[PDB]
């Protein structure tokens, strides 16, 4: 026995969008078309002779399919941008004709035509009794031509010449390149297949048929690190979390769950308890060695700026910071927090060792306190390490078309540790003259826990600069070195857990997680340059089509959307209209440029050959003979807008100053209005003698509005009533105003057949690294860039 008391909670939908990481971005699903791109269609119209009488035969004419043209000369250009976005999504990547080829119902031998529509046309002409004989004989000898040795075919078609130039361009310009064994191995980058430790293997060889779609891997034409410090922060925090995923776990931490059971049942048998050979310290764990190995590699591969976090009262975290600044270049550590760590080593460890006065380092001095203590110190070995830290920089070299920042050559070797521990030994044999003896005993106990680890620290530098060197082959986008907004906290009490808890076991990144880090840096970089070129081709086609009214925030709003890592609603109009000034200056890619000219050359042939829109009416205020046509009979049409002053009705609605036309419409001057007017058909002849066509323009004077204009297009022919006025009386029909309208083209069948060609068979393959199955050499003997191995220390 219940009772429900429910109330109205107001609905609140905040502006948001879904954000995916780089690990799960779906690649672009490839488009292949099913039917041809048709915009013109043959239609059956009655025909009228020169007298006006209806003839016994009929005639075929090209008219549009779904002719929905909006009125007004600006809405037509807004339609043709919409048509240009319709051909691009229908444009296929690979087009085979064996998928779309239907049987001709009647031919000499039973061949195939290329579409279900162009078979419906060629059977409409055959059973039509009114057709000529030589048109019917042409459909009989209309079969395909197939050649097996080059695997191309030749299917016939019946296409409009505008429709043919859109389908012929889809066939010759396809994104399929051939594929075989010697081109799968070129997909793997050069620093992996020319590496000793990875051995690359594959089972199946691909045929002479199989093709693949190469991604446009050219570097970012937008300089999104230049002046875009809120978009480069989120495009590197999306790369730092991807790079953290592929950096491997240390072998001292990780093992399976059952091996703990496998090592517990024999631990009491084989007593190996101090094999690890380390002095313990409070605050040392292995979960921070595994953490600091990943936030040193993945903050280098994505170029985040780390921020050091430490306490001054820990004399071991400052000694382990000496190893950190001498391997990672100081351009990565942020200046407000590199300096407070670089000064804390000076005022605690270096300057009390020599008895010098601790330095007055004011805030914001342009010289960092290692660059000001290589001049003030008088030793040679600790002034040789302070010269390396002051000049440790990334070396921007371009390798395989991808600019990436390799480390210094001494850091990959390990020789920097032999420069530090040669300097960390002379600093331990000093006397510490000012400070008391227990302060000398507190450093000399802690600086010797790091000089005892020289064999394990000359090799961490080898391994840290080999995991960074190997994984850097898998990037594709151009890594630039620019200081980002938000920083990644690296705790300096977690470098101490790295420096003295590693040992004798190389962790080398397995090749199954190199091919995954490379197939998500291609699937994002190819999802970048296919959204630049999709959003440049609309910005340049907006300015070329003269759309002065379109606010182009919207076609940059979805460019940032399809890159799945940006949140749109927290990116304002400031960072979306600066981006329009960069996308405008770029050249549009060749497939979109060659197909916009195929709209722009004949955006006046699509517009003129359609009903329910007429391109302006002309007014004469004098009787003139209206010309005889065969599809209309007698029509007040004008094919050329010549001899008359023109008024642009796109501008007469824009500025709205009607003072020109309403002073030119009362005085009866001959005026040719120009625009896109919806016309009506008045087939009666006794409306023409009553001069109905002149009475429609007087609603521009009393009422300002010009969009409510309907010019009259007469049609006088035999099926029209009261036609005997033209027959008995010898008069040609005379109108006052005629419509500037174009005649539809005739459907000449033998001139509209086109022989479309394509290949017989492809097998388009999606990704290519499924075939090559790589494996790594045993990490006891794994080779660095030197041919000596890493983890060689006993």
């Amino acid at each position: 026995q219940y009772e429900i008391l429910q109330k109205t909670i107001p609905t609140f939908e905040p502006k948001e969008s879904i954000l995916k990481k780089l690990e799960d971005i779906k690649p672009e699903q490839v488009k292949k078309q099913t039917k041809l791109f048709r915009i013109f269609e043959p239609r059956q119209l009655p025909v009228y002779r020169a007298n006006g009488e209806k003839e016994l035969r009929n005639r075929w004419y090209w008219k549009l399919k779904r002719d929905t043209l909006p009125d007004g000369d600006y809405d037509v250009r807004e339609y043709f941008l919409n048509l240009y976005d319709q051909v691009l999504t229908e444009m296929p990547d690979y087009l085979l004709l064996k998928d779309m080829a239907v049987e001709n119902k009647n031919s000499r031998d039973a061949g195939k035509v290329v579409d279900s529509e162009t078979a419906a046309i060629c059977d409409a002409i055959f059973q039509d009794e009114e057709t000529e004989g030589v048109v019917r004989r042409f459909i009989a000898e209309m079969r395909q031509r197939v050649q097996a040795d080059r695997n191309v075919v030749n299917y016939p078609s019946i296409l409009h010449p505008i429709d043919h130039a859109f389908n012929e361009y889809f066939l010759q310009h396809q994104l399929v390149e051939p594929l075989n064994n010697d081109i799968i191995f070129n997909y793997i980058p050069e620093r992996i297949r020319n590496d000793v430790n990875y051995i690359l293997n594959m089972d199946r060889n691909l045929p002479s048929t199989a093709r693949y779609i190469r991604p446009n891997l050219l570097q970012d034409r937008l300089n999104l690190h230049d002046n875009f410090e809120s978009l480069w922060d989120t495009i590197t925090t999306s790369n730092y979390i991807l790079a953290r995923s592929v950096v491997p776990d240390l072998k001292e931490l990780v093992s399976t769950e059952a091996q703990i059971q496998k090592m517990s049942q024999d631990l009491q048998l084989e007593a190996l308890t101090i094999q690890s050979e380390t002095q313990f310290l409070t605050g040392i764990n292995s979960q921070a060695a595994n953490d600091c190995f990943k936030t040193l590699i993945a903050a280098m591969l994505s170029q985040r700026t780390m921020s050091l976090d430490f306490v001054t009262t820990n004399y071991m975290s400052l000694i382990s910071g000496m190893w950190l600044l001498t391997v990672v270049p100081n351009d990565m550590f942020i200046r407000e927090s590199l300096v407070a760590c670089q000064l804390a080593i000076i005022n605690t460890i270096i300057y009390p060792a020599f008895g010098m006065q601790r330095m007055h380092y004011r805030n914001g001095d342009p010289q960092t306190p290692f660059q000001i203590a290589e001049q003030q110190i008088q030793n040679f070995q600790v002034a040789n390490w302070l010269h390396f830290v002051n000049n440790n920089q990334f070396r921007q070299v371009v390798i395989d078309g991808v600019l990436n920042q390799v480390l210094n050559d001494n850091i990959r070797n390990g020789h920097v540790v032999n420069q530090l521990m040669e300097a960390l030994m002379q600093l331990s044999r000093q006397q510490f003259p000012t400070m008391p003896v227990d302060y000398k005993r507190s450093i000399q106990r802690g600086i010797l826990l790091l000089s005892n680890r020289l064999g394990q620290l000359v090799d961490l530098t080898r391994l840290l600069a080999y995991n960074y060197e190997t994984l850097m082959a898998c990037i594709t986008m151009n890594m630039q070195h620019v200081q980002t907004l938000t920083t990644e906290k690296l705790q300096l009490t977690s470098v101490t857990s790295l420096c003295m808890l590693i040992g004798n076991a190389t962790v080398i990144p397995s090749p199954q997680t190199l091919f995954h880090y490379y197939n998500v840096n291609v699937n994002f970089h190819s999802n970048y340059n296919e959204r630049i070129n999709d959003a440049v081709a609309i910005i340049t086609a907006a300015n070329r089509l003269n759309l002065y009214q379109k606010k182009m925030k919207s076609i940059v709003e979805d460019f940032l959307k399809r890159l799945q890592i940006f949140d749109i609603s927290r990116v304002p109009d400031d960072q979306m209209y600066r981006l329009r000034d960069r996308l405008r200056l770029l050249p549009v890619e060749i497939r979109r440029l060659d197909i916009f000219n195929l709209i722009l050359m004949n955006m006046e042939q699509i517009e003129r050959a359609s009903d329910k829109i007429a391109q302006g009416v002309i007014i004469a205020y004098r009787d003139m003979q209206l010309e005889r046509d065969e599809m209309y009979g007698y029509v007040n049409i004008a094919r050329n807008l010549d001899g008359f002053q023109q008024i642009n009705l796109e501008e007469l609605m824009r500025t709205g100053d009607y003072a020109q036309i309403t002073n030119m419409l009362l005085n009866n001057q001959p005026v040719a209005l120009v625009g896109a007017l919806p016309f009506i058909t008045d087939s009666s002849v006794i409306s023409l003698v009553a001069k109905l066509d002149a009475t429609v323009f007087a609603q521009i004077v009393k009422l300002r509005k010009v969009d409510t204009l309907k010019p009259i297009l007469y049609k006088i022919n035999s099926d029209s009533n009261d036609f005997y006025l033209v027959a008995n009386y010898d008069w040609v029909p005379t109108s006052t105003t005629k419509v500037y309208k174009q005649i539809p083209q005739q459907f000449d069948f033998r001139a509209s057949m086109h022989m479309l060609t394509s290949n017989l068979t492809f097998t388009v393959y999606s990704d290519l690294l499924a075939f090559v199955s790589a494996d790594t050499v045993e990490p006891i003997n794994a080779v660095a860039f030197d041919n000596m191995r890493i983890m060689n220390e006993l």
């Binding site: 199946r204 199989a210 199954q512 091919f515 995954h516 097998t763 999606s766 499924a770």
Partner: peptide
């Protein structure tokens, strides 16, 4: 990772098959 790429093999080996 292992299951995702082992499914990526059998969709790419099957276009050949």
């Amino acid at each position: 990772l292992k299951t995702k790429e082992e499914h990526q093999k059998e969709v790419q080996y099957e276009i050949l098959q």
